[PDB]
Coordinates of C-alpha atoms and ligand atoms in Angstrom, one line a residue:
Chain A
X7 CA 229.1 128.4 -23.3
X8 CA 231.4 126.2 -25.0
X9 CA 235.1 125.2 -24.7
X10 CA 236.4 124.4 -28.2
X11 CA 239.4 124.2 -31.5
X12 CA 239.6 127.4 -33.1
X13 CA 239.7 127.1 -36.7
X14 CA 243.5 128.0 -36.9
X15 CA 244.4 126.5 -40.3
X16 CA 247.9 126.9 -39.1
X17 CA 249.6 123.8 -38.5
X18 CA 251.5 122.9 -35.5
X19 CA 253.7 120.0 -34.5
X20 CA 253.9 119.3 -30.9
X21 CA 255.1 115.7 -29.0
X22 CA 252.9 113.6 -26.6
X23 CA 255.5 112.4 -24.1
X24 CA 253.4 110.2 -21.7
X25 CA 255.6 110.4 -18.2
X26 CA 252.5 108.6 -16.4
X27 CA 252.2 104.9 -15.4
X28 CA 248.8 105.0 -17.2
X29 CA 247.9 103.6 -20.8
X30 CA 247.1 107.2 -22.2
X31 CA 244.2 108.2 -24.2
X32 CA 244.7 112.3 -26.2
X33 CA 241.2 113.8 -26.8
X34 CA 240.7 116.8 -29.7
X35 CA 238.2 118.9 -28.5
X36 CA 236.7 119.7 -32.3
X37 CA 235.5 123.2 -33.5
X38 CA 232.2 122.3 -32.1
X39 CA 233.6 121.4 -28.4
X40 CA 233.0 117.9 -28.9
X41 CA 235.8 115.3 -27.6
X42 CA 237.4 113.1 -30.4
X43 CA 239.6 109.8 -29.3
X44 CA 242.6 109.7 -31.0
X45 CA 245.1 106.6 -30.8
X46 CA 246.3 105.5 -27.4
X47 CA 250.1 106.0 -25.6
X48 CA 251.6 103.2 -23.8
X49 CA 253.5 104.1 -20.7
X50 CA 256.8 105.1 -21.6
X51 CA 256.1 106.7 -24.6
X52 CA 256.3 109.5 -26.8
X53 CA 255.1 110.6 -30.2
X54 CA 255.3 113.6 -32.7
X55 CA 252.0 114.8 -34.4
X56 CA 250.9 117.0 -36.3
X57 CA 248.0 119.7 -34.9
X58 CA 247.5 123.2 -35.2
X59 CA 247.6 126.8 -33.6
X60 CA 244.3 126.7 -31.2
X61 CA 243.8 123.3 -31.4
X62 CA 242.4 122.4 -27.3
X63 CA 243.6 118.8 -26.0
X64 CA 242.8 116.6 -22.8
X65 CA 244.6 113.5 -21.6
X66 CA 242.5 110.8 -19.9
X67 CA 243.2 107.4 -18.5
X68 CA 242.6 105.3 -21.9
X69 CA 240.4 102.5 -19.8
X70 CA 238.7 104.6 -17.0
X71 CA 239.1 108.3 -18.6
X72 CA 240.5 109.6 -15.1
X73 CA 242.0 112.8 -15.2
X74 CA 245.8 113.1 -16.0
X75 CA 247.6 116.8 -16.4
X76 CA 249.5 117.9 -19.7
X77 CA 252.4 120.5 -18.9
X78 CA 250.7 120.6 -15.3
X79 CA 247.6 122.0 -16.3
X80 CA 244.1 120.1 -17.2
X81 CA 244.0 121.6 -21.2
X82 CA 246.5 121.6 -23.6
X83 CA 246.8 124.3 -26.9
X84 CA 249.5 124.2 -29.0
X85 CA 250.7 127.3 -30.3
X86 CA 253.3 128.8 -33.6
X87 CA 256.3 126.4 -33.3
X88 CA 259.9 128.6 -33.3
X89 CA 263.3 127.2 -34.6
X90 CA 261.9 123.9 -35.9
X91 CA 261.1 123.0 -32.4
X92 CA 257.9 120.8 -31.8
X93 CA 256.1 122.1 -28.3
X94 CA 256.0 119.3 -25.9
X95 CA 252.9 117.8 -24.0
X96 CA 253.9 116.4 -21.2
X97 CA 251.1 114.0 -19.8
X98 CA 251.7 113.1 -16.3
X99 CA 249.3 111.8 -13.1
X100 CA 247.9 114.7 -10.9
X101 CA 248.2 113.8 -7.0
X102 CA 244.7 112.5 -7.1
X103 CA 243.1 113.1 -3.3
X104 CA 243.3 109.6 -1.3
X105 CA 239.8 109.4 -1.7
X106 CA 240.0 109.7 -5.4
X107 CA 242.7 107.2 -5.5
X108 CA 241.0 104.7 -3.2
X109 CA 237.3 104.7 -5.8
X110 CA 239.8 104.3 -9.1
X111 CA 241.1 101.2 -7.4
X112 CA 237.7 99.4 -5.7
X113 CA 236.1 100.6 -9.4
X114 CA 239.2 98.4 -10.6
X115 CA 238.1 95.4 -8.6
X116 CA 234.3 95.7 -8.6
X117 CA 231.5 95.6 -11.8
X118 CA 229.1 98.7 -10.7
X119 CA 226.0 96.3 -10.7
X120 CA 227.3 95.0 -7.6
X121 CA 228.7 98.7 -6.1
X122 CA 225.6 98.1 -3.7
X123 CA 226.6 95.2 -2.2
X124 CA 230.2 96.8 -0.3
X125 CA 230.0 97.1 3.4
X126 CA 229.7 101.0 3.4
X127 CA 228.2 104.3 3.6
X128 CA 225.3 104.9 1.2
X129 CA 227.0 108.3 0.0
X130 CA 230.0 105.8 -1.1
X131 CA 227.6 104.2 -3.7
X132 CA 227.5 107.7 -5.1
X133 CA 231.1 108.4 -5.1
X134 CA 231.9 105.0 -7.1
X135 CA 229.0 105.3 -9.4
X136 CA 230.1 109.1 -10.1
X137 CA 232.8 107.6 -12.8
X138 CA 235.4 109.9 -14.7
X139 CA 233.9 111.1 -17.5
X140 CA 234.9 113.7 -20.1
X141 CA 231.7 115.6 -20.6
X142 CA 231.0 116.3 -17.4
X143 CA 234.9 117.4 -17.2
X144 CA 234.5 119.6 -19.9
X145 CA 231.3 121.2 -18.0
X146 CA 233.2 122.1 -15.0
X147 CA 236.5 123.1 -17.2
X148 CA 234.2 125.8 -19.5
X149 CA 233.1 127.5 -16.5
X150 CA 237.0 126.7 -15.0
X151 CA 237.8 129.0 -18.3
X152 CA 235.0 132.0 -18.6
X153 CA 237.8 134.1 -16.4
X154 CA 240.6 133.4 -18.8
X155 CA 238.4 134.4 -21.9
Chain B
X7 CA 268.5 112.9 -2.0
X8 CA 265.9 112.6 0.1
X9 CA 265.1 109.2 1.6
X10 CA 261.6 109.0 3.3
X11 CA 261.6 106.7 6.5
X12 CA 259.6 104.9 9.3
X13 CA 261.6 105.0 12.6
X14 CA 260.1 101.9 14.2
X15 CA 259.7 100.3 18.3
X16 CA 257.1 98.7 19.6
X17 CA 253.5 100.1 18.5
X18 CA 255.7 103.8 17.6
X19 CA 256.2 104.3 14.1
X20 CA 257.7 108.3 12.9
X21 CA 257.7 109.0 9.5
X22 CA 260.0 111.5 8.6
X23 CA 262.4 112.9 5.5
X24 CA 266.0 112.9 5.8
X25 CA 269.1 113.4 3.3
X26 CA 271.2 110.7 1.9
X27 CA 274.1 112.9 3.2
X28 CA 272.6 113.0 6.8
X29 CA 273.9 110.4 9.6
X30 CA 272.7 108.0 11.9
X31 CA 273.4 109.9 14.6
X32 CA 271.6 113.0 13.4
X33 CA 268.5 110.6 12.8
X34 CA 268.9 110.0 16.8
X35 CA 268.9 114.3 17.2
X36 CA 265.7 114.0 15.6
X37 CA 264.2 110.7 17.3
X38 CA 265.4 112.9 20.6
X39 CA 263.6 115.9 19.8
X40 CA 260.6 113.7 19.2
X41 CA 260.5 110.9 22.2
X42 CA 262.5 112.7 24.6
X43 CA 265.6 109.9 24.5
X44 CA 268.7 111.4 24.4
X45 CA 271.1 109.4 21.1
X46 CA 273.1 107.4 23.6
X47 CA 269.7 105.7 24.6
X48 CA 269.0 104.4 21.2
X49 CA 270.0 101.9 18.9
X50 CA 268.8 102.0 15.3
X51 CA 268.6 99.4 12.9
X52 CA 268.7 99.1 8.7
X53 CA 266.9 95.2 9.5
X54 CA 268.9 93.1 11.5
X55 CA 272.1 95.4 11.5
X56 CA 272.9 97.9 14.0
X57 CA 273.8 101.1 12.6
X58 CA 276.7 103.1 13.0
X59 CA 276.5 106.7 14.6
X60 CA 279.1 108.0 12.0
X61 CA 277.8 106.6 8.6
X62 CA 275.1 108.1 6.0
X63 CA 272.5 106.8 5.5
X64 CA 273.9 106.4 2.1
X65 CA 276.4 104.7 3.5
X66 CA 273.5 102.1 5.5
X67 CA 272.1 101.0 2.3
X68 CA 269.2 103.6 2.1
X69 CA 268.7 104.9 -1.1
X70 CA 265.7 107.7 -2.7
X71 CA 264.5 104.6 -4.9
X72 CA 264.2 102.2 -2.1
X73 CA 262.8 105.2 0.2
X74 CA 260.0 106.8 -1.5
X75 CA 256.9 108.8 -0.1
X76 CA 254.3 106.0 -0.7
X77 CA 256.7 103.2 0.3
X78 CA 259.1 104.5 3.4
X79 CA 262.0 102.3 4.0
X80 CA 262.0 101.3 7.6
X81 CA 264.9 102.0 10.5
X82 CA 264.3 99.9 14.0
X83 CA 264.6 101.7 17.5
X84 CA 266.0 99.8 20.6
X85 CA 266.2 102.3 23.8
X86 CA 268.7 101.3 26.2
X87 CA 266.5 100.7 30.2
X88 CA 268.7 101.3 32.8
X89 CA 271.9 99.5 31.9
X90 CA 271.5 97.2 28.9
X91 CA 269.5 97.9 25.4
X92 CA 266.1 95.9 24.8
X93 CA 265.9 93.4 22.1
X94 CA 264.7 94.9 18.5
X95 CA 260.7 94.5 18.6
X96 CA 258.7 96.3 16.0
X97 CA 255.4 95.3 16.4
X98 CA 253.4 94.0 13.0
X99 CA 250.5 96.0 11.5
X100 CA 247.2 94.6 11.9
X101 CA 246.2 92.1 8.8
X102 CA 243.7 93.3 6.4
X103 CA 240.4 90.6 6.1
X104 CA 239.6 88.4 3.3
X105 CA 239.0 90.0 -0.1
X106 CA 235.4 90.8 0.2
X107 CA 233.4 88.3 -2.7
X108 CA 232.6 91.0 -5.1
X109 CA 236.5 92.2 -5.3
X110 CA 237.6 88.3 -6.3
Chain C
X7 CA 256.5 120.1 15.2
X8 CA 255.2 116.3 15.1
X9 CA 251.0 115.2 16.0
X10 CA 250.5 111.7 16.8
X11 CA 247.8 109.9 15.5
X12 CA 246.6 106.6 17.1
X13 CA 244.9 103.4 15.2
X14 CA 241.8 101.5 16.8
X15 CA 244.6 98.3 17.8
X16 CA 247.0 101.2 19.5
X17 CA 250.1 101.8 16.9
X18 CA 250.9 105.5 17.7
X19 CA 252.0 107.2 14.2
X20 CA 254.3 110.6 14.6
X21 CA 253.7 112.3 11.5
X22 CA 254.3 116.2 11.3
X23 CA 251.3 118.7 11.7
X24 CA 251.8 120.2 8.3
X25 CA 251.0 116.3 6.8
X26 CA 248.1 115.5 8.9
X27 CA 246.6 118.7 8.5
X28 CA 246.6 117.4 4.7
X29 CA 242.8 116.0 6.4
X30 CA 240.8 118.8 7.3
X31 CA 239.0 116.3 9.7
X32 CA 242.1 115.8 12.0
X33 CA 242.7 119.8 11.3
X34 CA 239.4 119.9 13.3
X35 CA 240.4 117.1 16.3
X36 CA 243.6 118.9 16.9
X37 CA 241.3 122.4 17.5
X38 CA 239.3 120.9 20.5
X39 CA 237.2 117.7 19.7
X40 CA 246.4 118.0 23.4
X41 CA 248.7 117.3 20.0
X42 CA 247.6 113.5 19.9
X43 CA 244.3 112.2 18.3
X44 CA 242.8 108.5 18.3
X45 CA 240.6 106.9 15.4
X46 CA 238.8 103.7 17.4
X47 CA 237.8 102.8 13.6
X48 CA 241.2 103.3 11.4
X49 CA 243.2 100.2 12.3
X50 CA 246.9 100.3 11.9
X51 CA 247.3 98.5 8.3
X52 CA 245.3 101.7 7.4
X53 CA 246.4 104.2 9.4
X54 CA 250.2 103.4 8.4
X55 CA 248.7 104.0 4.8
X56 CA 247.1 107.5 5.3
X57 CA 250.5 108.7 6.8
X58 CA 252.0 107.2 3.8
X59 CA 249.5 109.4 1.6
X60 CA 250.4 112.6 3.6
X61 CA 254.0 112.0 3.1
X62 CA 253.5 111.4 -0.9
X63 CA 250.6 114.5 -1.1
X64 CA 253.7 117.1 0.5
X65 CA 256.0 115.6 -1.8
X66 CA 254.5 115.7 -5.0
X67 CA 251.7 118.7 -5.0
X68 CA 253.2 121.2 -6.9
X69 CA 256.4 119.6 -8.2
X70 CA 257.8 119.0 -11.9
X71 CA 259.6 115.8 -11.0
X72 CA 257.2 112.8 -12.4
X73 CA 254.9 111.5 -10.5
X74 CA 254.7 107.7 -9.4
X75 CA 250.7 106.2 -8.7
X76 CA 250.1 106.1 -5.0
X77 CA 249.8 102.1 -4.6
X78 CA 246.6 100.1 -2.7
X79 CA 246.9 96.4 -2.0
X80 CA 242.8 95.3 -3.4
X81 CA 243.1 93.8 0.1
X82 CA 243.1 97.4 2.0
X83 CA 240.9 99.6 -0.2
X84 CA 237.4 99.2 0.9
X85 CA 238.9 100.4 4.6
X86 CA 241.5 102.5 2.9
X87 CA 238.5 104.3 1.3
X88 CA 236.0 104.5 4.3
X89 CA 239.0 106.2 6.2
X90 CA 239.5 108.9 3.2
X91 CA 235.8 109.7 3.2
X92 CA 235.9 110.0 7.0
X93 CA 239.1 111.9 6.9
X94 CA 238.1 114.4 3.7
X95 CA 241.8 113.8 2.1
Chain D
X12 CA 227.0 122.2 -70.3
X13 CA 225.6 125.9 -71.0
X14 CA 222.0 126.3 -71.8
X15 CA 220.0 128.4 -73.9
X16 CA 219.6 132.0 -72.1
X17 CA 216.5 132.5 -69.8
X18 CA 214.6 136.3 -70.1
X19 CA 216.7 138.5 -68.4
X20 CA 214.8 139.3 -65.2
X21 CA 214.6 135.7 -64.6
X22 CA 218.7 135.6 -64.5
X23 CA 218.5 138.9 -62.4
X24 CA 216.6 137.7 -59.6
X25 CA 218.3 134.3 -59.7
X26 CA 221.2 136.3 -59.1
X27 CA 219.8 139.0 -56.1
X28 CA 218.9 136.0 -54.0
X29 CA 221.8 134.0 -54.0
X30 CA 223.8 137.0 -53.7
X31 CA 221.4 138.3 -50.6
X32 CA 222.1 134.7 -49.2
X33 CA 225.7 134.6 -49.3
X34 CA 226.2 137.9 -48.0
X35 CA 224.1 137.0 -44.9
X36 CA 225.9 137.9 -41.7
X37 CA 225.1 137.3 -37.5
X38 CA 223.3 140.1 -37.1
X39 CA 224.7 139.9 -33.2
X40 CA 228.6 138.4 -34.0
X41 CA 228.7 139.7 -37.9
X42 CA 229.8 136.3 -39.3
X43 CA 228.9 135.6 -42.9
X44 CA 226.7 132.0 -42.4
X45 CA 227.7 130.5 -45.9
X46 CA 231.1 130.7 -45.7
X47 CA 231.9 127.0 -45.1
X48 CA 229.1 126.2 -48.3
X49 CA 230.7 128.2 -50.9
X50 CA 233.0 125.3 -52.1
X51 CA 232.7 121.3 -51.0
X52 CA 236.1 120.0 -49.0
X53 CA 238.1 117.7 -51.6
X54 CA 237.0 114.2 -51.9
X55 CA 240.7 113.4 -50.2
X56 CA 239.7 115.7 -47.2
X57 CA 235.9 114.7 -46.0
X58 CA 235.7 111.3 -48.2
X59 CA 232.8 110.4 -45.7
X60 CA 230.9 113.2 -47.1
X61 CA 230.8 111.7 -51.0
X62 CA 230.2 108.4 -49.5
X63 CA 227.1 109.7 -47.6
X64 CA 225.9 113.1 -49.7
X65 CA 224.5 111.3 -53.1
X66 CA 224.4 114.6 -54.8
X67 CA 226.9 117.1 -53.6
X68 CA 226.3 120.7 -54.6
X69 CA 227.7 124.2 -53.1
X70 CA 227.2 128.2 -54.2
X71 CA 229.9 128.1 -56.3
X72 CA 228.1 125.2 -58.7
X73 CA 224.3 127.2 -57.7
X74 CA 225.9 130.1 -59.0
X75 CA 227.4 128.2 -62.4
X76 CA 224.2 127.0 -62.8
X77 CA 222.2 130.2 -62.6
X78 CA 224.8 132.1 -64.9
X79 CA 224.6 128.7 -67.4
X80 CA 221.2 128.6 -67.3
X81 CA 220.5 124.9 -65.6
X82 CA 217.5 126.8 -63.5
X83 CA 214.5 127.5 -65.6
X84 CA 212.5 129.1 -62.6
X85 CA 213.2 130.9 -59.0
X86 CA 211.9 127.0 -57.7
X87 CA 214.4 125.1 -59.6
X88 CA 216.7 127.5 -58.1
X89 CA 215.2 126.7 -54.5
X90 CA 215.4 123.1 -55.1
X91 CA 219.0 123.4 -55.2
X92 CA 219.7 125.0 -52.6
X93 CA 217.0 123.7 -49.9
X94 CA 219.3 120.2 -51.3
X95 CA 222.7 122.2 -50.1
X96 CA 221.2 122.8 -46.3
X97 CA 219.4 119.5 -46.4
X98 CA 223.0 117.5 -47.0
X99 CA 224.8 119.6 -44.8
X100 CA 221.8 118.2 -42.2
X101 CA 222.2 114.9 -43.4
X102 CA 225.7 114.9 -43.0
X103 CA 226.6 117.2 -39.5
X104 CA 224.5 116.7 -36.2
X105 CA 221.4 118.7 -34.8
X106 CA 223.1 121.3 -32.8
X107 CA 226.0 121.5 -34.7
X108 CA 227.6 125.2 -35.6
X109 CA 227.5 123.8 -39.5
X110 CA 223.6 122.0 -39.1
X111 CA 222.6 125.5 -37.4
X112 CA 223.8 127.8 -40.2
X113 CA 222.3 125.3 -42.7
X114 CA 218.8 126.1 -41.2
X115 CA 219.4 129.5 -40.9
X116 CA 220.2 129.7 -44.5
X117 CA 217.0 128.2 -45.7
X118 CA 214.9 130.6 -44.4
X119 CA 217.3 133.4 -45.2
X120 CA 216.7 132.2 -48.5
X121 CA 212.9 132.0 -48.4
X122 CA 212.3 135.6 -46.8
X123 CA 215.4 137.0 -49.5
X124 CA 213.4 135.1 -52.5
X125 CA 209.6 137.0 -51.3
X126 CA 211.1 140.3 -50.8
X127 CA 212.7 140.3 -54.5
X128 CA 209.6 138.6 -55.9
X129 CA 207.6 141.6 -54.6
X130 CA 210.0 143.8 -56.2
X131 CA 208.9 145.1 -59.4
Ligands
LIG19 C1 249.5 108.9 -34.1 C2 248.9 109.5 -32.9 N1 249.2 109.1 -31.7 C3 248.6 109.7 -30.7 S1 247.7 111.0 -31.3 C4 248.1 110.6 -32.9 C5 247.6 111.4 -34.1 C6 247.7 112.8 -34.0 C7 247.2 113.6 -35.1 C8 246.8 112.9 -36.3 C9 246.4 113.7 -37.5 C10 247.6 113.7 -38.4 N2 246.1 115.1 -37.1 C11 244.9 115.5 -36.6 O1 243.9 114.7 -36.6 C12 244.7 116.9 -36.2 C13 244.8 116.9 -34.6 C14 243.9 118.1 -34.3 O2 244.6 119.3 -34.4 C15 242.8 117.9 -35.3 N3 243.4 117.4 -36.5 C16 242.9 117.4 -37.8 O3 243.6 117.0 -38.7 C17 241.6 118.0 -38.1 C18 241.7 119.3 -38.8 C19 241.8 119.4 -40.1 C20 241.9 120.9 -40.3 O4 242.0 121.5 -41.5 C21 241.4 122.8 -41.5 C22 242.6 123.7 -42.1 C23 240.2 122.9 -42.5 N4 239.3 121.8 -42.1 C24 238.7 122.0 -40.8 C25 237.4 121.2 -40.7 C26 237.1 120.8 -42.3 N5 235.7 121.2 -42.6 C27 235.5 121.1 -44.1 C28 234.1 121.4 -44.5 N6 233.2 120.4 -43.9 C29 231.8 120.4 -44.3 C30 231.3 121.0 -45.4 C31 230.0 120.9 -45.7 C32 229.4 121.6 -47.0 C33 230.2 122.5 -47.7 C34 229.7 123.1 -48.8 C35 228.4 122.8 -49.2 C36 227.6 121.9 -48.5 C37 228.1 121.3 -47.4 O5 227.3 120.5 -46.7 N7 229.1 120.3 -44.9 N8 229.5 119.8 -43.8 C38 230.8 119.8 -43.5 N9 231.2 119.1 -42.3 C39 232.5 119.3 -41.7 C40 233.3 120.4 -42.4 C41 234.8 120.1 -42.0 C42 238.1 121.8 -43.0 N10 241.9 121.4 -39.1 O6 241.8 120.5 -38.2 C43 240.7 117.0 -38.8 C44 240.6 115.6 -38.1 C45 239.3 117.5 -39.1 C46 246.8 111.6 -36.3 C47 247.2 110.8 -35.3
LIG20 CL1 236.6 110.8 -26.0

């Protein structure tokens, strides 16, 4: 099973708007569903680029690769501008859970060689060594997508 | 506008939602419905100064961008006992310990 | 309709139901195990933060308007964190 | 550039193989595998590929070179292409949909070149 780019060959120009706080990283999803880095957005930010019909995007934290939403939703795909009118991505923060929240910010403030040397629950280990990662997003977000074909 | 609140006395703290529009005294209504002290019992605060039944809280100094949903501003309670009104006292949150070594 | 939830040092927090049943762990103390529940672990400088995380959670699921970062003081997370895993929110 | 003609057969078996090879489709999803080999990207759009690929070569040039007579045998023939799949693996990963179709290829090209060598 794999989430991936069609090969369109129609162009499309769409604008990034970051409306996060974050330092935002875009990642193309090439024709073989592998994730490809593309330059970074500075909060407060917007730019226009050119993509094409099909074409599957993810927005990430550019430090930690946490999650952020484009248009509300986890994938982005531009389709056939109309009227001269890029389509706008807008990249935003999801409400991350409190828990979520609270292991970005210890992982902010801790290396994880020393992870195991917090006062806490084993099963917390876990959780903080469990980092963001786009693979094993894109994992979850292919079976996520079997249902919308 | 919503502005996003902790009421404040003692060791009570409500958090709560209200309009810009609203007014102090319809901030009592709800403090009433929620500690059982009718609005004539209560004095609330915006810091040191009293507040004034009739005004907004627009008109108070609360705003939606110094009154947000991760960051309440904060109104003080006074009930009156008996005759007379207590001093303000809002009792402090506990302190967090010393940055554990690993986090410095 | 308000619950109150009470921190190990005794600061009683009056939040609405709908907010603290954000926690499916306090959804669980208010069904048996009154409309009041104590947490002998979550001290207030935590507890005042968790309501805080309610109020922000109702705000902002499901809303176009941007979204700010919930803030954590370095000095409150590890606590901050124990209480999330505890609470399930 | 064009060579003296090889016997005819020769030519005509050249010809039924790479033609038997390009045609090749998915026998489950019906795509035709050397689509993406028939012609090199530009030098301007996969410049990695020149810089990597020391001799570049696609159907369109194996076919030029069968109908000018560069191949002198079915193996010369082979060479070339087993050196198309072979830099499509050098330049793509394992496990790519472009590496995959490159190995299929190969020994669609094998099994085409001993059915039409049986052939009379
Ligand atoms: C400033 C800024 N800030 C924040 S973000 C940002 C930014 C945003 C955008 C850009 C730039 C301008 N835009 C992009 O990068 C956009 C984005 C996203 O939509 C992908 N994309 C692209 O441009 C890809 C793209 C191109 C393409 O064009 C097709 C019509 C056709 N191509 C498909 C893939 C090729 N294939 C060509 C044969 N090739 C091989 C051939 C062979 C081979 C052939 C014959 C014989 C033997 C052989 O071995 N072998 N291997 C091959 N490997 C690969 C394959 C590739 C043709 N569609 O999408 C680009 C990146 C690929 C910039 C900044
Ligand atoms: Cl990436």
């Amino acid at each position: 099973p794999v989430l991936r780019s069609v090969n369109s060959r129609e162009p499309s120009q769409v604008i990034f708007c970051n409306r996060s706080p974050r330092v935002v990283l875009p990642v193309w999803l090439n024709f073989d569903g592998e994730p490809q880095p593309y330059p970074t957005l500075p909060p407060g930010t917007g730019r226009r680029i050119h993509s094409y019909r099909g074409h599957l995007w993810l927005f990430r934290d550019a430090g930690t690769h946490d999650g952020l939403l484009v248009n509300q939703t986890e994938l982005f795909v531009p389709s056939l501008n109309v009227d001269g009118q890029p389509i706008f991505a807008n990249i935003t923060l999801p409400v991350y859970t409190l828990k979520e929240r609270c292991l970005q910010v210890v992982r902010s403030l801790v290396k994880p060689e020393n992870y195991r040397r917090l006062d806490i629950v084993r099963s917390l280990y876990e959780d903080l060594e469990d980092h963001p990662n786009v693979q094993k997003d894109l994992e979850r977000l292919t079976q996520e997508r079997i249902a919308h074909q | 506008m919503d502005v996003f609140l902790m009421i404040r006395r003692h060791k009570t703290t409500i958090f709560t939602d209200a309009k810009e529009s609203s007014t102090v005294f319809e901030l009592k209504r709800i403090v009433e419905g929620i500690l059982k002290r009718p609005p004539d019992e209560q004095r609330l605060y915006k810091d040191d100064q009293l507040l004034d039944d009739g005004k907004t809280l627009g008109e108070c100094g609360f705003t939606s961008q110094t009154a947000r949903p991760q960051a309440p501003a904060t109104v003080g309670l006074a009930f009156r006992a008996d005759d007379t009104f207590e001093a303000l006292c809002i009792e402090p949150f506990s302190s967090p310990p010393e940055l554990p070594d690993v986090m410095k | 309709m308000y619950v109150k939830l009470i921190s190990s040092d005794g600061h009683e927090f009056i939040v609405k139901r709908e907010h603290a049943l954000t926690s499916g762990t306090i959804k669980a103390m208010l069904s048996g195990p009154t409309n009041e529940v104590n947490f002998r672990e979550i001290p207030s400088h935590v507890l005042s933060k968790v309501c805080m995380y309610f109020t922000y959670k109702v705000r902002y699921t499901n809303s176009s308007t941007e979204i700010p970062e919930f803030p954590i003081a370095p000095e409150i997370a590890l606590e901050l964190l124990m209480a999330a895993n505890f609470l399930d929110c | 550039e064009k060579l003296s003609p090889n016997p005819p057969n020769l030519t005509k078996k050249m010809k039924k193989i790479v033609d038997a090879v390009i045609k090749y489709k998915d026998s489950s999803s019906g795509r035709q595998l050397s689509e993406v080999f028939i012609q090199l990207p530009s030098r301007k759009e996969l410049p990695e590929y020149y810089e990597l690929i020391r001799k570049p070569v696609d159907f369109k040039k194996i076919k030029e070179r069968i109908r000018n007579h560069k191949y002198r045998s079915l193996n010369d023939l082979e060479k070339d292409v087993m050196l198309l799949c072979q830099n499509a693996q050098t330049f793509n990963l394992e496990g790519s949909l472009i590496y995959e179709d490159s190995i299929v290829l190969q020994s669609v090209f094998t099994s085409v070149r001993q059915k039409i060598e049986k052939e009379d």
